[PDB]
Amino acid sequence: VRMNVLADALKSINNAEKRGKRQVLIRPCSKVIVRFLTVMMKHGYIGEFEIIDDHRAGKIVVNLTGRLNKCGVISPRFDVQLKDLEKWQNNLLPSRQFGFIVLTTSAGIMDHEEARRKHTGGKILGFFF
Amino acid sequence: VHGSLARVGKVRGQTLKVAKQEKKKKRTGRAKRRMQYNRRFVNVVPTFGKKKGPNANS
Amino acid sequence: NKGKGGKNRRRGKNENESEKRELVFKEDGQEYAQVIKMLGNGRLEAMCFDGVKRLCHIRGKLRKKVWINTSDIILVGLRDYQDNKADVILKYNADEARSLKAYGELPEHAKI
Amino acid sequence: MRAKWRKKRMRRLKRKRRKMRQRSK
Amino acid sequence: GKAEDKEWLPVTKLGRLVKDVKIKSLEEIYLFSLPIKESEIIDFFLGAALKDEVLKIMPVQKQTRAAQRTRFKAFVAIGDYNGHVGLGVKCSKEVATAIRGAIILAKLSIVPVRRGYWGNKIGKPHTVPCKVTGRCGSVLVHLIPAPRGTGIVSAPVPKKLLLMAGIDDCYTSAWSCTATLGNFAKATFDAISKTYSYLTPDLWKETVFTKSPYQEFTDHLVKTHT
Amino acid sequence: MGKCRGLRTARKLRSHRRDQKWHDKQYKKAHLGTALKANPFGGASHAKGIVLEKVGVEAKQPNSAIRKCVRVQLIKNGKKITAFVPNDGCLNFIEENDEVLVAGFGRKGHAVGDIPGVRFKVVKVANVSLLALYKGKKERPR
RNA sequence: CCUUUAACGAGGAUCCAUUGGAGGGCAAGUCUGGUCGCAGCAGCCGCGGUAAUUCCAGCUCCAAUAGCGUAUAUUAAAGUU
RNA sequence: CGGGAAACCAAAGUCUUUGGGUUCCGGGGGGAGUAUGGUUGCAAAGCUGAAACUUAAAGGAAUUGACGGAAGGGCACCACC
RNA sequence: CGAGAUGGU
């Protein structure tokens, strides 16, 4: 059965990007998916997006610009502390110059570079580059 | 064959014996590394690209 | 000259067991023997004419060349240790075996 | 069928060994 | 005899242009992704700066009614130690012809190599721009950025191609049957080749088009030429 | 292919690895102790024994020789061994009913080269080394 | 004992550096004499059957150096737990 | 599409750009599905299941030959009518 | 649709 909705959303975008398609449809929608998409959009990796109401959790249509190399999920939501975050970005990123880990923290869902300014740890959700 | 097969020590016992022909002392320590550097880098004679090793006999 | 087996395999050099087959006698550490039984694996049971029976082995030079058989006459090398075991050096033809006995070299035990 | 026959050979040897040991005590 | 001119006369549109007019570098041949088929084009642009290396000479053979029939296969690498490298292979009945043939194919295969930084952007670039990989047969090869002054951390075969490409610092990894030198060399050259076609945030701005060399020099190829 | 990943799975992961280590041939013989009872040295690097008998063993094909060996009884267990004698003519130093020091042949209990079934070599005879006898530095005291 | 200080103390033929190697993996001889599938070598692939780059020796050369070789437990190499 | 050592596979794909959930289970070739203990069965037998010792390869997919008491064309009084 | 095993140089 469907054990996790965020893993479907990112796998669906990742297969559409590799085929060269200009749009994709995500279903079911969730509060976690809308907040994750917003972090990719603010850094310039995807275009703007629209939500459809249907009285059953809803759907999203997203616009693609061709810049995204990958996006992905870490399935157990492991806890991270500021001293251990260096080991995770050494494992998951392609260079020290670009790409982002996404964390959930009591100050909100955010970019791993913002978590250092806000002096906060959290749980891992995923990444993009 | 002379005597039996499975006789131990045969070839070391047959071999004709020759005394050492050396006389002069070799260098030690720093002086040997100095000599090896001058012989391998400082004055050298070029060849065709099929370059030749340090113990070439023929 | 005449082949005495029959096959494709002319790929060797011919045996030439002929001409200057100069007759060989014992040195120290050797005996004459008669083959009593042949076993597997390149080994045999032999009796020498002063009466000590031994287990005996074909030297690597005689492999697939000098075919030994039951009641055949051979030259054998003794070991300075492990006296129950020995190695074959030569085979004598029935023409050479009678010359050994004519020189009085063999006791009147060997069959020809 | 050599493996099926090696299996039959082992079964008859084991039947002999069974009857031989269980007679002893 | 003496090395006078006219050892070369062109047989392609690109060769007619390179010998005559202001095609000023290989980079304006790469920008339009054109095939190179005359070896003398790369001697005109890079020339005596290119240095040459025989990686292995290998015997191979086929069975026949009479006997085994043997040929010799040579692997050759070439480069200038500043952003260009190539690899080439040929199989012939004699070793001297195999090496001479392999050098021509190693010149026709040359590609541009990208370089970048591990840390802050001081001086000129010295390592790979990001983590990359290449494959051949079962063999897999992977390259990783490194801090200034480490050198190359690799086995002998990949180290020689990275040195000829002009990369100072690199961490590396490999998987499956590296004991086959031909697949190990091609997996390494595949990883090096991919460095200039990975989309990165400094390449995101919009492209501006220009005319190609066949369009700019469209009358030079007609008025006095064949 | 299907490995479990849930955040409370540590008992399944830890105990499945523990169970699967017993299929590695090197791990098992080090931890059961059957190999330590079987080994004719009780975990030592060397042993002393007394020379029973001098023998020549036939080498395995494709080559041809008679390899000079000795049969030996160990002092601390009374069990029986056969051991190789290195270098040309060294069998002449050994004699019979005297002490040798024996060592492994270099492959951790397996046989070496063309010699069938020999796992050990001689290194010392009557408290003098075979190298010191062979290079003429020492002699057997009599 | 170490540090300090008078008197004796060096021409090299001595006030003399060793332990393992030279087919490949792996730095270094398609030299010269002996043996002849024997004696022996060889972690592994392999050398020796009368013209041995591999055994036994002379000469020359290689590597580390007041140190170098071998047996056995154990970590890395092992993304072969 | 993409994957693979290849034969091949719309899954045997979305993997060094490596993490949707979860059950069983392999670790060079032999000795061996054997010995020994337990357990089920009227019996035959089923289930669970070692070690000492031995060895440099055993194995998979594909290429060029040779070979067949395999098939199809064509030829020769050193073949036959 | 008779019978047609084997292999020192």
Curated annotation (Swiss-Prot), chain A:
Alphabetical UniProt keywords: Cytoplasm, Nucleus, Ribonucleoprotein, Ribosomal protein
Record-linked InterPro entries: Ribosomal_uS8, Ribosomal_uS8_CS, Ribosomal_uS8_sf
Residues bearing the modification N6-succinyllysine: K87
A GO cellular component entry from the record: cytosolic ribosome
KW ATP-binding (keyword) present: no
Gene Ontology molecular function terms on file: structural constituent of ribosome
Gene Ontology biological-process entries: translation
Subcellular localization(s) per the UniProt record: Cytoplasm; Nucleus, Nucleolus
Function of the molecule: Component of the small ribosomal subunit. Part of the small subunit (SSU) processome, first precursor of the small eukaryotic ribosomal subunit. During the assembly of the SSU processome in the nucleolus, many ribosome biogenesis factors, an RNA chaperone and ribosomal proteins associate with the nascent pre-rRNA and work in concert to generate RNA folding, modifications, rearrangements and cleavage as well as targeted degradation of pre-ribosomal RNA by the RNA exosome. Required for proper erythropoiesis.
NCBIfam families, alphabetized: PRK04034.1
Subunit structure: Component of the 40S ribosomal subunit. Part of the small subunit (SSU) processome, composed of more than 70 proteins and the RNA chaperone small nucleolar RNA (snoRNA) U3.
PANTHER family: 40S RIBOSOMAL PROTEIN S15A
Family, as annotated: Belongs to the universal ribosomal protein uS8 family.
Name of the molecule in the record: Small ribosomal subunit protein uS8
Lineage of the species this protein comes from: Eukaryota, Metazoa, Chordata, Craniata, Vertebrata
Curated annotation (Swiss-Prot), chain B:
Residues where N6-succinyllysine is found: K50
Subcellular location: Cytoplasm; Nucleus
Signal peptide per UniProt: none
Domain of life (superkingdom): Eukaryota
Function of the molecule: Component of the 40S subunit of the ribosome. Contributes to the assembly and function of 40S ribosomal subunits.
Assembly notes: Component of the 40S subunit of the ribosome.
Record protein name field: Small ribosomal subunit protein eS30
Protein's gene: FAU
Section of the entire sequence shown: 76 to 133 of 133
Curated annotation (Swiss-Prot), chain D:
Principal localisation: cytoplasm
UniProtKB keywords: Cytoplasm, Ribonucleoprotein, Ribosomal protein
GO term, biological process aspect, one: translation
Tagged with keyword Ribosomal protein: yes
Compartment annotation: Cytoplasm
Keyword Metal-binding listed: no
MF-aspect GO terms: structural constituent of ribosome
Region: Disordered, residue numbers: 1-25
GO annotations of cellular component type: cytoplasm; ribonucleoprotein complex; ribosome
InterPro entries per UniProt: Ribosomal_eS32
Pfam families assigned: Ribosomal_L41
General function of this protein: Component of the small ribosomal subunit. The ribosome is a large ribonucleoprotein complex responsible for the synthesis of proteins in the cell. Interacts with the beta subunit of protein kinase CKII and stimulates phosphorylation of DNA topoisomerase II alpha by CKII.
Subunit field text: Component of the small ribosomal subunit.
Assigned protein family: Belongs to the eukaryotic ribosomal protein eS32 family.
Name of the protein this chain belongs to: Small ribosomal subunit protein eS32
Higher taxonomy: Eukaryota, Metazoa, Chordata, Craniata, Vertebrata
Curated annotation (Swiss-Prot), chain F:
A GO cellular-component term linked to this record: small ribosomal subunit
Recorded GO MF terms: structural constituent of ribosome
Record-level GO BP terms: translation
Basic residues: compositionally biased ranges: 1-20
Residues recorded with modification N6-succinyllysine: K54
Intracellular or extracellular location(s): Cytoplasm, Cytosol; Cytoplasm; Rough endoplasmic reticulum; Nucleus, Nucleolus
Modified residue annotations for 3-hydroxyproline: P62
Region (Disordered) location: 1-26
Gene3D superfamilies for this protein: Nucleic acid-binding proteins
Cysteine pairings via disulfide bonds: none
Keywords: Acetylation, Cytoplasm, Endoplasmic reticulum, Hydroxylation, Isopeptide bond, Nucleus, Ribonucleoprotein, Ribosomal protein, Ubl conjugation
Post-translational modifications reported in the UniProt record: Hydroxylation at Pro-62 affects translation termination efficiency.
N6-acetyllysine found at: K135
Principal cellular location given in the protein's record: cytoplasm
Cross-link (Glycyl lysine isopeptide (Lys-Gly) (interchain with G-Cter in SUMO2)): K37
Function: Component of the ribosome, a large ribonucleoprotein complex responsible for the synthesis of proteins in the cell. The small ribosomal subunit (SSU) binds messenger RNAs (mRNAs) and translates the encoded message by selecting cognate aminoacyl-transfer RNA (tRNA) molecules. The large subunit (LSU) contains the ribosomal catalytic site termed the peptidyl transferase center (PTC), which catalyzes the formation of peptide bonds, thereby polymerizing the amino acids delivered by tRNAs into a polypeptide chain.
Family of the protein in this entry: Belongs to the universal ribosomal protein uS12 family.
Subunit comment: Component of the 40S small ribosomal subunit. Part of the small subunit (SSU) processome, composed of more than 70 proteins and the RNA chaperone small nucleolar RNA (snoRNA) U3.
Protein name, UniProt field: Small ribosomal subunit protein uS12
Record organism: Oryctolagus cuniculus (Rabbit)
